[PDB]
TrEMBL record, chain A:
The lineage of its organism: Eukaryota, Viridiplantae, Streptophyta, Embryophyta, Tracheophyta. One of its GO terms (molecular function) is acid-amino acid ligase activity. This is UDP-N-acetylmuramoyl-L-alanyl-D-glutamate--2,6-diaminopimelate ligase MurE homolog, chloroplastic. Residues 118-323 form the Mur ligase central domain. Residues 346-491 form the Mur ligase C-terminal domain. Component of the plastid-encoded plastid RNA polymerase (PEP) complex. One of its GO terms (biological process) is regulation of cell shape. It comes from the Eukaryota. Belongs to the MurCDEF family. MurE subfamily. Residues 30-106 form the Mur ligase N-terminal catalytic domain. GO terms for cellular component: chloroplast. It comes from Nicotiana tabacum (Common tobacco).
TrEMBL record, chain C:
Belongs to the RNA polymerase beta' chain family. RpoC1 subfamily. DNA-dependent RNA polymerase catalyzes the transcription of DNA into RNA using the four ribonucleoside triphosphates as substrates. Coiled coil: none annotated. Signal peptide: none annotated. This is DNA-directed RNA polymerase subunit gamma. Zn(2+) binds at C26, C28, C44, C47.
Amino acid sequence: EPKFRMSLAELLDESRVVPLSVYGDLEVGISGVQHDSRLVESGDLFVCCVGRKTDGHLYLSEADKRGAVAVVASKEIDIEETLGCKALVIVEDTNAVLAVLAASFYRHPSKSMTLIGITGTNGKTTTSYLIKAMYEAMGLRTGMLSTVGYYIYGDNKLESPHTTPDAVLVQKLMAKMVHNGTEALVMEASSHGLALGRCDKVDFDIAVFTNLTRDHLDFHGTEEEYRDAKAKLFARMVDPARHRKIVNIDDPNAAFFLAQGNPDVPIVTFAMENKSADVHPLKFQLSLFETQVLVNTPQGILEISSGLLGRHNIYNILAAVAVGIAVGAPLEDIVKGIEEVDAVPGRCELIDEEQAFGVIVDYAHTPDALSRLLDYVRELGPRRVITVFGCAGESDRGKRPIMAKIATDKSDVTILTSDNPKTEDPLDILDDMLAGVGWSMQDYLKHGENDYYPPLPNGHRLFLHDIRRVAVRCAVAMGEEGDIVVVAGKGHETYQIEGDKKEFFDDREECREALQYVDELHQAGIDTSEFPWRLPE
Amino acid sequence: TCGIPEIAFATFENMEYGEDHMKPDTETYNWVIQAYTRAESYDRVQDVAELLGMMVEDHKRVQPNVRTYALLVECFTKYCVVREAIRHFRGLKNFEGGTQVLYNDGKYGDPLSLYLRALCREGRIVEL
Amino acid sequence: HYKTNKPEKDGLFCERIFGPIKSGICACGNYRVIGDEKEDPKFCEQCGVEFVDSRIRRYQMGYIKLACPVTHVWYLKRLPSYIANLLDKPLKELEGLVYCDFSFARPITKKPTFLRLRGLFEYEIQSWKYSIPLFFTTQGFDTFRNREISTGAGAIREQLADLDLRIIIENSLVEWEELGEEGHTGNEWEDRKVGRRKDFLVRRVELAKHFIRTNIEPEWMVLCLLPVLPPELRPIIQIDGGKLMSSDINELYRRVIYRNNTLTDLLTTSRSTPGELVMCQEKLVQEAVDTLLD
Amino acid sequence: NVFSPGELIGLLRAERMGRALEEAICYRVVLLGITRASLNTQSFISEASFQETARVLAKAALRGRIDWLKGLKENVVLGGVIPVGTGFKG
């Protein structure tokens, strides 16, 4: 039961799949037609995939090589040479072929059940799961797809290499879930996924943006391109008083996207400082464990969700409160959503439940995101800001010094490691990060023979180590009570590629074990105040 | 130009302890000094000093030319015995066109550069 | 062989490693005429034959892999030990680690380490070591231990391996210059001591300078692989009444071979068994090699 | 840099360098016994391996010594024509 209405030629004919040239008919048995060659299987018709990386001819060639029965391309494609069925059809329109790849009944079920798209610059996945939990608490089973895992419908998420899977494969999975095991099939994609065409080829019931800003500026080549694409996709399939435009009023791209489309759709703002949005925290309970706010709005719920971040998590909770109140006016239904938001997900994780020093696992690789997360932690961090991260090999060489500078500018003590060696020589990119503060690995090593370790001119401190595990355990152990340790090297990722081989030894269980054994370390008498641990005798 | 300093000393020895027609001249001493100076494997500095001593002993017959002063400065500098290097420089300067010789198109480690860099580290700036 | 008079495989007299015993007759027993390589398998499918000559058993060499790093006797034995001259550490301290169980604490100055006692060889491992391992990840301890705790001669090999010669000269000259302060102006006992240090210093500078320009790497003194003499030169013919026909070379060789095999297995067989089991036999391997060499 | 504190150099050499070099070379004559003399020579092979074989060989391996075979005993070991008499080529 992978899909339906895709194993007959009449089903493709009803789907307006006009290729202008076909041989015989689509008699080959195929559960669901997939535009992508990798998503399609042997003996299954594969329509042309429209994309900047892979064109129609390349997609048809890859499908014929993989064994697809039918391959669509602008020119004549010899798909029957290496296929299980001699019948094939070449469609000269790549976009039309990619649209007709999804079956009619397959696209109809996901469009009829429900749909919720969340394409934001920052904090989109934090609100997507909250909206999914709110919809689940409402009484309708649904799934929210993310960049880490593609989940068309249902609680479980299938493994996908790319951030946004194929549109035809996503539609087939959504139809299979809606057939049995799921009541709603919501397709949620980020700005890049929406601009590529993953979530664009799906009727979205509610299309709101968590954070509208310059997204895919280097890829699309023009600002507000992803917002315009999302607005066009929402206007393609829009219903009166059914689409939600909940977005921060401070962002001009959000207002520009809300201006486009059908005006009959409901519009609302989730800004806290704006008086027109009528939403406001009106509470002072920010903490590393839970930050509860008493929202006082006419449409929004009274209680808010406990967020780990000061403003980002609060903004995500405010954006999700609108989607939670749209289904049910009562605030009691948002209790499950608030509990799921406080569950400390992979992204911007909160501290551990055990009584110990705060540990925050974040996903920060780009300089701007790292800087904003560091600023939010400084605003949240009461006493100290301890961070440990590293750079990836064969990456942007100019990114390491600016990252090291932005980290050392606002952190008292920072540890520099090798987050992703990936065949690059160690102690080389580490020296690149050390050169940002003007130090060289020679200066540090010759100081390490002594027991002084002079600090930075601004008064801060900087440490480094080659291996990631020991340094991370030390950073988790070198922390004060009121201080919190931030690990911005990797978040939901669980892969460390040290050279040619990769090891999956990066997770929060190691931090939990370290926080559990720090008691025994302190009982033994070891000093974990600085990098040179004072070992007794 | 071989790389093995000894092959040249053997030819020198045939000359130094031979008849008058075959005796060494200033060009000869200079070729042997090059071998020792531009050699890549062993200390070869005591050797240069001894050779210089022989030349001084034959003073009446042989007197130095510009390449002599040039070659000498490279050896003493590269080996970090800067005090003698400066004594020799006094001579190359008196000659005209000298600096050009010491920097042999920058071919072998830029000897002219090496001198200056060293003089500084040693704080011998009056000499600089 | 035991009463078979055929060389065993992987044996001190093995044909395949050391060449054939009778010309042209391979391990199997067939004869192909050497002098012709036109259609002769240099190595037979059934066995490594090397069909050409028995002369090779005179010149062919074989090597033995050792699990544990070991140290050559000559460099250590001389009073002006070459290793000691390079080390600039007390001779007793480097030797104690080598022949007795004592553990260095700061083996490599090359890479930064979180633990910071920076100690020398210390007899007591009583410092919490189990809780440290429990706190640390599996092998997280290994990375830390390798950086810090040191034993046997792997430590010497590693300390010798990352050393700065150009720097060594600088320190030495300065120390040599400082010494001699108030020289030649004290009680007989004192001057003697002042001088002995004074020389150790010159000797050490010299060794290092040579190393800079000589193409010989200082770490090679501790030995990873071990060489074996060609099989004929140790005839070890059956002691058919000769009673000394078997070589002592062969007798000494077996011992090193044995202890080494016991260790390779011990580590593979018993990761669980403590360093005490490995420590016991490390010393044993070293001693066999020592007798074989000098 | 040129000379280390305790070394043995030859008289003609030292004298030559002294004229040339203003650097102070301080030296005094040492009478060497017949036995000591052999141990300090140009050839590790024979001239020096006549008594302390292990000790010489070790020092040399470390220093990568190169011996130009210019004497009699050395060429005998190598089984090659000695450079004396009929062997001296002229």
